[PDB]
Design a protein around this ligand. Sequence first.
Ligand SMILES: [Zn+2]
Length: 395
Amino acid sequence: FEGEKVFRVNVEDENDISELHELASTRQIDFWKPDSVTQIKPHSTVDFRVKAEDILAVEDFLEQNELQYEVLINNLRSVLEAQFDSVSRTTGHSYEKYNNWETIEAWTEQVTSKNPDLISRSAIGTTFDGDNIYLLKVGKPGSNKPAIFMDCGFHAREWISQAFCQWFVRDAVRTYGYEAHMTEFLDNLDFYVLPVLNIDGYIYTWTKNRMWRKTRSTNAGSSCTGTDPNRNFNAGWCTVGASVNPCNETYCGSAAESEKETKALADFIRNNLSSIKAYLTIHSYSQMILYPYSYDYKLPENDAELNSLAKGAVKELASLYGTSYSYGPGSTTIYPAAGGSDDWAYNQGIKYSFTFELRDKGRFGFVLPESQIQATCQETMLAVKYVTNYTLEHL
Ligand SMILES: [Zn+2]
């Protein structure tokens, strides 16, 4: 990634957008936010990364076409090297460093051995490459308890996400029998934590390409690999904001629940549907909290409640470090996109469905350094406990 840059471009009107369709059709641009050219709306900003060889061609195009730009990241290489900056001496699992999957997979086992009373572990299926999808069920085991489902690592390159589901499990165990609310939550609820949905991708971002997002499944008729897991749900499946071309990053898959991974999660949730009261899905970057709908401009019945709950949670979050989040329904907060899990869980009847986009807001983007793991996870924990406490009192 030596000499590659990340740009922030502003787009004023629809001609600006169609000018960026022509750019994209001519250079290989990696869109960071939004996740495709097709999801840009006027009067907004677009973050994307450009290959070293393309830097001058793109800075001419923007200039010659009046697109006002800023260089977010001058050398991605540096940012990639600053990444692993944990002041931890440990070769194994740390909560304050980014763990590879071998290391995560062994952690799920160890943490279950060490806190058998509070933690239980399953494999809810197997990934494309045959990796096991582990789910941890966190709670004081009880007759007929309501649940909260939380997953991380749907998109391979959003590593802070993966880091969060681990932190959560560490706190849930540390503050049991010491923190009043956390002890009552684990008594009253179970938490289902799926620390990594897209394992195959995650390993690919470790081994080959840090910037990968999709699954690693093979596509018929093409040598292009992967579906976007957050387009592969049966919520308006592929009807807007999603491609049928497998070589796109927004490839919606060949059918709803075409991925093994997303079929496992969808099935697990459906089998438990009467317990699970809330659905939380952790992504990165940009500091937002989204709630349904993304597939449509229609508002959920619930809208006013979800809106106030989001506003409260984002108010909690900021307490610690002053971190600003924004929130709203996904379609107008961003742009319509079909097949996401939040919209699907909601349409299953789960009234409280959120996506969180953690830090930052583009200084590092996906390539957030290990040094910001902990602060990031502490403030999120504050929005997470708030909403848990909300749901508990509305069961
Ligand atoms: Zn994501």
